[PDB]
Amino acid sequence: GVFTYESETTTVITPARLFKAFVLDADNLIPKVAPQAIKSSEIIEGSGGPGTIKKITFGEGSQFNYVKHRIDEIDNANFTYACTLIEGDAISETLEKIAYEIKLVASPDGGSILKSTSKYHTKGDHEIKEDQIKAGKEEASGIFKAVEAYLLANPAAYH
Numbered sequence: 581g582v583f584t585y586e587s588e589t590t591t592v593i594t595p596a597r598l599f600k601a602f603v604l605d606a607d608n609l610i611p612k613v614a615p616q617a618i619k620s621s622e623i624i625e626g627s628g629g630p631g632t633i634k635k636i637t638f639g640e641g642s643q644f645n646y647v648k649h650r651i652d653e654i655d656n657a658n659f660t661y662a663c664t665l666i667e668g669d670a671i672s673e674t675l676e677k678i679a680y681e682i683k684l685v686a687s688p689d690g691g692s693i694l695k696s697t698s699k700y701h702t703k704g705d706h707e708i709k710e711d712q713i714k715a716g717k718e719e720a721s722g723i724f725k726a727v728e729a730y731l732l733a734n735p736a737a738y739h
Contacts (some may be wrong), residue, residue: 581707583700585717588693589724593731595692596663597658601739602694602727603651606629610723613730615639619648629654633666638715645670645715652679659684671712676703678716696720 591598602609608692610621613654619639626632632651637643647668654661659690661684665677685693 581702581705583702583708583713584697584715585649585700586695586697587717587720587724588695589728590687590689590691590693591728592687592689592691594690595659595686595689597731598692598694599661599684601731602724603661606723606727607634609727609730614717614722614726616726617686617719619643624648626651629656629661631732635668636719638670638719640718641670641715647671649680670715671708672708674703675708676701678708678712680716680720694724696724 602677602730604627607623609622610618617638620637621634622637623634626634629651633648634650635646635648637646647670648666649663650666652662652664661682663672663680663682665679671677678698680696680698683695683697685695687693696718700713700716702708
């Protein structure tokens, strides 16, 4: 019973800001500016690409609900990157793992477009409760939207 939810972060900032800053500086951004998604985004190793793992502790999950994500796939050619649950305890039970896949598209606004489509993989016929499904949507919501604004409101900040 695979579920599919998605969101789109249309950023006025250039794709570079997303492919580099949004992704690589995530551990400085999300835990601080996006606490409504992830209270602790602890990157273990990786330069923002193949093998880049990070242990993700959700604050809404009250620290008990946590799961190690990884850059499961990344394409420098057309600018695409995906995330997977590798370790931790959020899904567990009889389920598999929820996936993320962010496509970098150029916006007609001169900015960019983060097409974050998540794929909630069920282990057989065992479905995932909407609680964790919401974590997938909201993870992308708090992260993307909160770094989005942090980034948009940093060159001038508060003037």
